[PDB]
Structure 1
Amino acid sequence: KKTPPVYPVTVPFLGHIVQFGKNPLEFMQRCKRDLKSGVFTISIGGQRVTIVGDPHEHSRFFSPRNEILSPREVYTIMTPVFGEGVAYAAPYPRMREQLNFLAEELTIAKFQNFVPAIQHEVRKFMAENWKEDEGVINLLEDCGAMIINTACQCLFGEDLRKRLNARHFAQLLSKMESSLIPAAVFMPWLLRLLPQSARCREARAELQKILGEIIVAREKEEASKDNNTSDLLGGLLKAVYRDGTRMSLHEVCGMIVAAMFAGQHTSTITTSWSMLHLMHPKNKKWLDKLHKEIDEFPAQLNYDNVMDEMPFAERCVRESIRRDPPLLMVMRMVKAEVKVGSYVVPKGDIIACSPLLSHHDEEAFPNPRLWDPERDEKVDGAFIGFGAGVHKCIGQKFALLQVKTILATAFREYDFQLLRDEVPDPDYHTMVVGPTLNQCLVKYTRKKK
């Protein structure tokens, strides 16, 4: 009949911004241990933030519709990235239509080309950059490059990959991004209008035009039929809203930007932790096992190699998303009271559910710091690496496709060694949390027989 515990505020303007910004894992865990309650409230600049940290309760969070627990507020910190009236910014009917359109373009029906195209770009990058028999590279850095490469390769039509290349596009992603403020999500009054924030404007507007140009190009080759180009951009342009309308350039640009920005960091980070773990000595058996699964593949890989025939490798990826969820927190705007366990949660609060917290609940994941791909969430619905319910991640299959593919190519044609005693500390100081960049230096030993 009343709110969840609160956590003592010793410095009233801050709330818990500092110990939360410092080590959110430790902290949230502390709240959950001390408050004797897996569900509890914290404050951020005096904004109530109720963390649903008991896995049995996940349903409570992910189930209510947008109108009760609203995404839109919590994501406004993106409207410059996506645009006005794009995604959440858009009314929920439309946002759903837009996300749907995207989702179609990312079903497995589209993936038929991808595994080969991905393998290609990876071998490319590796030969152009892992030229020597040995050498030391930054695994987080490179991967980031492989990912943006392999993604465009997959979702980007020849002509568009011409006028825009992966490397250049990434600079639009950085550019667009750098102008973001995490804090904004709790305190958007910050949002009110801030110097490079133009950039994200510039970064976007530049991109948009590029596409607006790209389109005119492909329309004037239809009489010929010169190319039957069905890349992500293609699909998006063919889509029709119910009301019989289509996506304006701005919405199309939005939805692709979203798509790629989405994949970029989450995917490179997951790739990074997975390789890291495997390449550790303690995980030899896990490496040994991986091999017994990719050794009897043809060099050229197809689909049936990847999804259907790499269950273990997929275990590694997921387990790695389990241990170090790139996205720490899923959040909504409580627009009306909601039951969560034996607590209620007041209209106006911020409700969150934390992959980071939940993946370290001891009931659900004994020894949560231990990376064990063979482990299984004791507690059904515990793992939320990809969210759940309505807004669960559509990019899910595609990302698994990339990482696994890359994992395969990489460890097949190379060996590896961590230049550190232990796998990198997470770096919780990025909006999308990865392994610590200046700790990701690795030594790649080419292979031969």
Structure 2
Amino acid sequence: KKTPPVYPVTVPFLGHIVQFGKNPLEFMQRCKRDLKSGVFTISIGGQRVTIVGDPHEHSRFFSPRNEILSPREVYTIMTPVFGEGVAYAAPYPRMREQLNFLAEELTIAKFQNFVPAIQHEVRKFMAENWKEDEGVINLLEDCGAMIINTACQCLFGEDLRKRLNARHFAQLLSKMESSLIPAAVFMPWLLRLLPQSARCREARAELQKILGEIIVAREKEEASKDNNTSDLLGGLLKAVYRDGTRMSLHEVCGMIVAAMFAGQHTSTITTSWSMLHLMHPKNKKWLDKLHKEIDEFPAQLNYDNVMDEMPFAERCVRESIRRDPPLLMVMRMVKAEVKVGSYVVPKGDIIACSPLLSHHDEEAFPNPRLWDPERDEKVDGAFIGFGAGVHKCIGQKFALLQVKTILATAFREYDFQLLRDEVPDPDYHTMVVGPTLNQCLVKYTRKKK
């Protein structure tokens, strides 16, 4: 009934906060290499943090119920973003229902309009921003704009996109977002109630009231039948809890924020990496192979084109998430003892499973730093870029749609070149990890026939 060994702590209260904050990949690896155990504990803020660094053992982390292993305590930090009693802040039965309602809004049934809607906004953005035959842009920054744009198009009804537009909205997000401090989960007391938080306060409330407005409007056009609007907001209003109740404005607001917040960063980063590797000259063959798959498409693309007819592109995307998972760490609060291989993990520990670590296990992913889209996880379940089990990603399919879609539209109507020797080094200093902002400059060369 014993622990994984604990890495030596040079200074107790810090634990390993420094070498962790500086390069968590190198660090966690060494812990692994020296400890010689995939599974090991580290001290951060004097907090037992046991990382599951063995691909075989993932099922352990993901399979267990929240009651046994709970996200909530860990993920409190979102609550201001999402709201009181929204998602994790909410009781698990409810949070589940909410997540489900959302998940339904993101099934492939809804996707019918999306590919065209997304392609439109990308072509808009390009023409307004890539006006010249050549030119230089920040790829991470542009992609960010393309994502929030194409998303709103995808999940926002006309009227809502009238009162509220993508660029502004992005601004609102970042405003609520700037509020976050990552340290906080492990040490939640730092969250107990913080300067811009008010902005998240105001950022959110502003949004909320806009909607509260929007709703009143759409209620009084059912009489007409004027529009049958089934955008994300639509669905959420038509949802009913089991107990027969409905979602209060706040919960609706929370769930839309959460939806948009997640995709925005995770997706824009994914897009960016993916393009980068492809652009790079070493990756010619892959770039060429990409083409062999999208050259023979009509300019206007449909659903069949993207899911069923771009297997490979999707490989590039997944490989990109494999090499540099946007979310380094997933976590639970061990609320009861759990077996993990030959070890046990004590109620009260903090238990994590790191895509970042796992994606660089050699058994599973030899030479991980190599971006090889045609590589296949050597150990089943190794890849966890979208997590697994109960709490696996719901946005996964929609995201793949957008990134895949964006890749096709951009590359089809453009070429590209990295303004550097080598693909950008990730920047581990952000809550969600993306390539380093300053190096994401590149030259766009238009194409013509």
TM-score, normalisation: structure 1? 1.00
Aligned partner of residue 282 in structure 1, secondary structure: helix
Q: Which residue number in structure 2 is paired with residue 102 of structure 1?
A: 102
Deviations 1:69-116 (A, max 9, x none): 101011100100011100111110001000000000000000000000
For residues 103 and 252 of structure 1, the distance between their equivalents in structure 2, rounded to whole angstroms, comes to: 14
Deviations 1:159-201 (A, max 9, x none): 0000000000001110000011100011111011211111111
Q: Which residue number in structure 1 is paired with residue 419 of structure 2?
A: 419
Aligned partner of residue 309 in structure 1, secondary structure: coil
Aligned partner of residue 283 in structure 1, secondary structure: helix
Q: Which residue number in structure 1 is paired with residue 177 of structure 2?
A: 177
For residues 304 and 26 of structure 1, the distance between their equivalents in structure 2, rounded to whole angstroms, comes to: 41
Deviations 1:254-287 (A, max 9, x none): 0000000010000000000000000000000000
How far did 1:354 drift? 0.3
For residues 276 and 191 of structure 1, the distance between their equivalents in structure 2, rounded to whole angstroms, comes to: 37
How far did 1:399 drift? 0.1
For residues 194 and 378 of structure 2, the distance between their equivalents in structure 1, rounded to whole angstroms, comes to: 46
Q: CA RMSD in A?
A: 0.4
For residues 75 and 211 of structure 1, the distance between their equivalents in structure 2, rounded to whole angstroms, comes to: 26
For residues 401 and 113 of structure 1, the distance between their equivalents in structure 2, rounded to whole angstroms, comes to: 12
For residues 382 and 338 of structure 2, the distance between their equivalents in structure 1, rounded to whole angstroms, comes to: 20
Deviations 1:390-445 (A, max 9, x none): 00000000000000000000000000000000000000001000000001001000
Deviations 1:14-73 (A, max 9, x none): 011111110000000010000010000001101110000000000010010000110101
For residues 227 and 297 of structure 1, the distance between their equivalents in structure 2, rounded to whole angstroms, comes to: 33
Aligned partner of residue 131 in structure 1, secondary structure: coil
How far did 1:119 drift? 0.2
Deviations 1:191-228 (A, max 9, x none): 11211111111111110111100000111111111111
Deviations 1:107-129 (A, max 9, x none): 00000000000000000000000
For residues 52 and 98 of structure 1, the distance between their equivalents in structure 2, rounded to whole angstroms, comes to: 29
For residues 72 and 420 of structure 1, the distance between their equivalents in structure 2, rounded to whole angstroms, comes to: 42
Deviations 1:330-388 (A, max 9, x none): 10000011101110001001000000000000000000000000000000000000000
For residues 341 and 18 of structure 1, the distance between their equivalents in structure 2, rounded to whole angstroms, comes to: 29
When structure 1 is superposed on structure 2, of 133-142 and 220-229 the one drifting more is 220-229
Aligned partner of residue 444 in structure 1, secondary structure: strand
How far did 1:5 drift? 1.1
How far did 1:7 drift? 0.5
How far did 1:312 drift? 0.1
What is the count of residue pairs matched by the alignment? 449
Aligned partner of residue 117 in structure 1, secondary structure: helix
For residues 194 and 58 of structure 1, the distance between their equivalents in structure 2, rounded to whole angstroms, comes to: 35
Aligned partner of residue 321 in structure 2, secondary structure: helix
Aligned partner of residue 281 in structure 2, secondary structure: coil
How far did 1:229 drift? 0.5
Deviations 1:305-325 (A, max 9, x none): 000000000000000000000
For residues 27 and 205 of structure 2, the distance between their equivalents in structure 1, rounded to whole angstroms, comes to: 40
2:270 is aligned with 1:270:
yes
Aligned partner of residue 445 in structure 1, secondary structure: strand
How far did 1:13 drift? 1.2
Aligned partner of residue 193 in structure 2, secondary structure: coil
For residues 188 and 247 of structure 1, the distance between their equivalents in structure 2, rounded to whole angstroms, comes to: 28
For residues 228 and 128 of structure 1, the distance between their equivalents in structure 2, rounded to whole angstroms, comes to: 31
Aligned partner of residue 51 in structure 2, secondary structure: strand
Deviations 1:225-268 (A, max 9, x none): 11111000000000000000000000000000000001000000
For residues 124 and 426 of structure 2, the distance between their equivalents in structure 1, rounded to whole angstroms, comes to: 29
2:90 is aligned with 1:90:
yes
For residues 95 and 228 of structure 1, the distance between their equivalents in structure 2, rounded to whole angstroms, comes to: 28
How far did 1:12 drift? 1.1
For 1:256-335, list aligned pairs within 5 A. Answer: 256-335=256-335
Aligned partner of residue 417 in structure 1, secondary structure: strand
For 1:126-137, list aligned pairs within 5 A. Answer: 126-137=126-137
Structure 2 unaligned runs (5+)? none
Aligned partner of residue 48 in structure 2, secondary structure: strand
Aligned partner of residue 93 in structure 2, secondary structure: helix
Q: State percent identity of aligned pairs.
A: 100
For residues 341 and 368 of structure 1, the distance between their equivalents in structure 2, rounded to whole angstroms, comes to: 24
Aligned partner of residue 176 in structure 1, secondary structure: helix
For residues 2 and 162 of structure 1, the distance between their equivalents in structure 2, rounded to whole angstroms, comes to: 59
